[PDB]
């Protein structure tokens, strides 16, 4: 008997550019009894209700991802799913709203 994994641990922004935001997280506390196969990153405009998927899970084995194609001076929010062969974790929201900016 196997379940979807738990939420990714400690998600954060760790870099930005004027057109991208880079997120990092840690492996979930539990994997539901089947190995983690990937992660799924979703991004929305902070002033929006429409989340957009940024990648295919099997394409994202590492616990970091650069979200590209973002508009400078526009605020975004992010959430990350852990995935295994059973399904998707509860998403782990990335705290706060974030601008893509040259820092």
Numbering used by the authors: 2 to 104
Paper text:
Encoded by the gene TTN, titin spans half a sarcomere (the basic contractile unit of muscle) and has various functions including preventing sarcomere over-extension (Gautel and Djinović-Carugo, 2016), acting as a molecular ruler for thick filament formation and as a hub for numerous signalling molecules (Kruger and Linke, 2011, Linke and Hamdani, 2014). Fn3 domains are only found in the A-band region of titin, where they are arranged with Ig domains in a pattern termed super-repeats, which themselves are repeated. Fn3 domains have a characteristic beta sandwich fold, with a core of hydrophobic residues as the “filling” between two beta sheets that pack against each other face-to-face.
Fn3-3 and Fn3-11 are found in the non-repetitive region of A-band titin near the tip of the thick filament, Fn3-20 is in the second D-zone super-repeat and Fn3-49, Fn3-56, Fn3-85 and Fn3-90 are located in the 1st, 2nd, 6th and 7th C-zone super-repeats, respectively. Fn3-20 is at position 6 of the D-zone super-repeat, and Fn3-49, Fn3-56, Fn3-85 and Fn3-90 are at the 11th, 10th, 6th and 2nd position of the C-zone super-repeat, respectively. The variant in Fn3-20, Leu18237Pro, was identified in a patient also carrying two C-terminal truncating variants inherited in trans, whilst Val22232Glu in Fn3-49 was co-inherited in trans with a truncating variant in the kinase domain at the A-band / M−band junction. Conversely, Fn3-49 Val22232Glu and Fn3-90 Gly27849Val were insolubly expressed in bacteria and following attempts to refold the protein after purification from the insoluble fraction, were shown to be unfolded by 1D NMR. The crystal structures of the WT Fn3-20, Fn3-49 and Fn3-90 domains help rationalize these observations. Mutation to glutamic acid would introduce a charged sidechain into the core of the domain, which likely renders correct folding of the domain impossible.
